[model samples]
Target: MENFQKVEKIGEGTYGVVYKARNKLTGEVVALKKIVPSTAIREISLLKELNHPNIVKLLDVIHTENKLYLVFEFLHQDLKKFMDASALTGIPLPLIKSYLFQLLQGLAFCHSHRVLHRDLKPQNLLINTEGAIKLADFGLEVVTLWYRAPEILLGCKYYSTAVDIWSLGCIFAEMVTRRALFPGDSEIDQLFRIFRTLGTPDEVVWPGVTSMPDYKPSFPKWARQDFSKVVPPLDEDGRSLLSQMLHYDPNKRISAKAALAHPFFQDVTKPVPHLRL
Candidate 1:
């Protein structure tokens, strides 16, 4: 709290007021996330161990008699703001590729460490002045269902890094079109949308689709929709990559490493950089 000049409130989260601040010693800008209710031990512990590029850096933890604060490297804006600004014209293909590459790199590192972002969304992805994307809000510690894998959608307790891959693909789609790709507002709607776009899964397509705890087909069957028409904006390589990510079966999906090698990133023309604290 000493000379950590609070510049302005950056945004609000489930727990506190996130503010832009400057450090006294290094004079570097940092995001100050203050937990208003109380500091949960789970998050404090996880934040300390979470050292990756895609994740916000927890430079220091400030403790007060009534609250706990997390000091993170200052990122100028979130994906939501970036999308809004880009939507006015159109998102540059190169920019989208860069962001997706970074998102997956960060997510892969998190999954390797056995951490689930639980709340992966555009609002949680911060874009620094350097155009680097960093994930925040690890405190949520939930499924982050926005990009959730088919296994999580069906309720498999044992999961893997595939969940974040799904989210990354979904985010890539959203960035291209500037809208929520899956409007799975309700479980029924969620399945309906998936089935509508990707087609209803059967034993042939997804051998394990019927085995989840929450598996159900209460929704009425509809004609199978074409993936290309649904995402016509994406090029052949982009579409292929998105399809692998949105595949009905997790096993059939590509790993983040494999996806990087996919042709979609060929034009990116640089090695994917791994995120580090």
Candidate 2:
């Protein structure tokens, strides 16, 4: 209260209040993540060393009288807000690759540490070079289940690293097409939308499918749809990468590490400046 002044309430991620605050002395702005509502401490909020150009940096921490405060650098905007601008037709394929590469770069780091970012969506990504990707169940309640992986939607007890990859694949389609890939109204509806394209996952297609928390036989079995028709702007490499991410089996999905090496990211040859006129 004496050192920093609360600017405004941002969004409540977990227990309560994440605020925009300013250092009364230094005049620099920062995110003040309160451990107010829930006094519970986390296993690994000590990520001051989880540094990367694509990852958000935590400046430090404060444990004043009654509560704890996580001091984080405040970013100006999130990726979701940028994409919703009506002036654009769709994001360019070349530019989209840059963002995709960055997203994978940060995620690969997280997965390397054995941390699964179960929640991955546009809202969790930042417009700045620093990716403010949250590791908890942050954005599903951002009010949409559109980018959820099939396994998560089906109630799989164990979440795999591919969960974030599925959301990235959905965003790729959405970024190119300027429309959400799946805007299912309900949980069952969400599964149906994914199934219509990727097809219903049987025990054969996906091991342990029948034993999922909400699995049912009454669901109609569907055949896979041509992905070329789904995201027409995608080339062969792009389509292949997406197919791997949207795989029915989480274990079989392309990892963020492998995705960075996908051919889709290969920049087409450009003549050197000195060689050109």
Candidate 3:
């Protein structure tokens, strides 16, 4: 508290409130998050081990009165807010390509380290004025219902990295269309929304889907949608990548590493240079 001054309220999370603050000595801006010790330990411990350009950086941790204050590199806004502001004209294709590629790069790093970002949504992705994307909120938790994967919805406890990939697929679709891919009101409706687009799966599509505790044999059959029509603005390769990511079979879904090699990013193979602020 003696070394930093609050600039303004930035946002709040399940465990804490975040504020835009400045280092009193260096004048460097940072996000200060006040959290309880229980959640703080896990979040800080994991963050300390992660070091990636596209992942938020934890600069320092301060403890007092059984509470913890986490200092992170500050960013301008979240992806959701950025998208909402740009929805009228739609995000540019090149920019979309860049953002998605960076997201995969970050996710690949996390997967390689065996860290599953169980909660992945637009709001959890921070963007800087330079157009850099940083994956935030690494704490364990279920993602928003709209981005929740089908396997998890079926009460499958053995979900793996594929679950995170599934969420990214939803986000990728949202980026292309500038709207949520599936905005369901409940868990059941969420699954229905997914099936409505990707088509209902069977044992053949996902071998053990029927074995899931919440599985049901009687879901309305829906024919899969044509990506060209669903995401009319995307190029063929872009649509192809989305299709692979959204596959009902987690086994069949593309991994973050594989997704980076997909043809969709062929034109921009090298990491997109950081945006010029």
Candidate 4:
């Protein structure tokens, strides 16, 4: 492949640069992700086997002498751009339900397929003109310390699909609030944020919390604070949903399946489906 015909650069992702391309032969628009060969590993392998509407499809992979190119379906924007460009805050309840449902649908499929989407942030969610959200980026995903289940976090070898549910919760908050739900500056800060909102994990709270390799000497001192002060601007239902998703002990967090069934989505004022893209 001498040249990709220089389609416009779409944007930069965690490990690669994305571009909108015109297939030289079929003239179809495609997203070309030029990733360093060094950055391709199990994550790429995981993506190669995934085919879901809410999960971006990797159409083809081009490997040259020293580089790797991933072809994906073209979409108009990512969640970040959509939020900034639309000047919207607190996504409407029905639309939130639709997107969250689709996201969970994709994640549930991945869970059954033995895949873990280690990275599930708002910037990684792509929105097409139809308001459909697609999960992007599998390059940094690995079955390890970060995206593992509560048991895995507690040094238990066997883990389950609940980890993605935790991610779903975080993603849902970010989407509705237009911000990182847990904006901890560091890992410890992140944990502290988790605790402050959901309460510290004790033996009774998270019986397995004491066994992890990095388990602290003692749980942080308990703090009583308003929920809105933590996330600051969410409504009662929003705060409640956020709290359940970010529960300190993974065992206690709401599962994606359960989350889909939560009442935060039970309103009937609007149609529950993808809205204006």
lDDT of each: 0.75, 0.75, 0.84, 0.67
How many Å off is the CA of 180 in candidate 2? 0.9
Clashes of each: 5, 0, 0, 1
Question: What TM-score quantifies how close candidate 2 is to the native fold?
Answer: 0.85
Deviation from native of the Cα of residue 131 in model 1, angstroms: 2.6
Q: Write the per-residue lDDT of candidate 3 for residues 1-277, one digit (tens) a residue.
A: 7899999989986568899999999999999988754674776776776889999998887876776888899987888887888888877788788889999999999999888888799989998776688899775244469988898899988789898899998898888888788999889999998888878888878898888899888878887888887887888898889989988888899999999999888886333333335
lDDT of 1 by residue, 1-277 (tens): 8768898987888678998888878789888888733446556865787798778888887777666888887766777777877776667777788888877788777776777776578878887666688888875423234555567767788776677787778888888877777767665666667777776777788897776788776645566676677676879889889888877677777887788788888777333222223
By TM-score, who's the top model here?
A: 3
Q: List ranges where model 1 is wrong by over 4 Å.
A: 24-26, 36-43, 139-146, 269-277
- Residues 151-243 of candidate 2: C-alpha lDDT, one tens digit per residue: 888788788788989998998888888888988988888999998888888988799889888889899989888988999978889899988
lDDT sort, best first: 3, 2, 1, 4
Candidate 4: where is the Cα deviation over 4 Å?
A: 36-46, 86-89, 139-160, 224-241, 267-277
List the candidates' TM-scores in order. 0.85, 0.85, 0.91, 0.79
User: Which parts of model 3 are misplaced by more than 4 Å?
Assistant: 36-43, 140-143, 269-277
lDDT of 4 by residue, 36-119 (tens): 544565457667878988888888877787777788888767776655654454566676677777887788777678777766
TM-score of 3: 0.91
| Candidate 2 clashing pairs, residues 3+ apart or interchain | none
Per-candidate Cα RMSD to the true structure, in Å, reads 4.5, 5.3, 2.7, 4.5
Query: Least lDDT summed over 10 consecutive residues: which range in candidate 4?
Result: 141-150
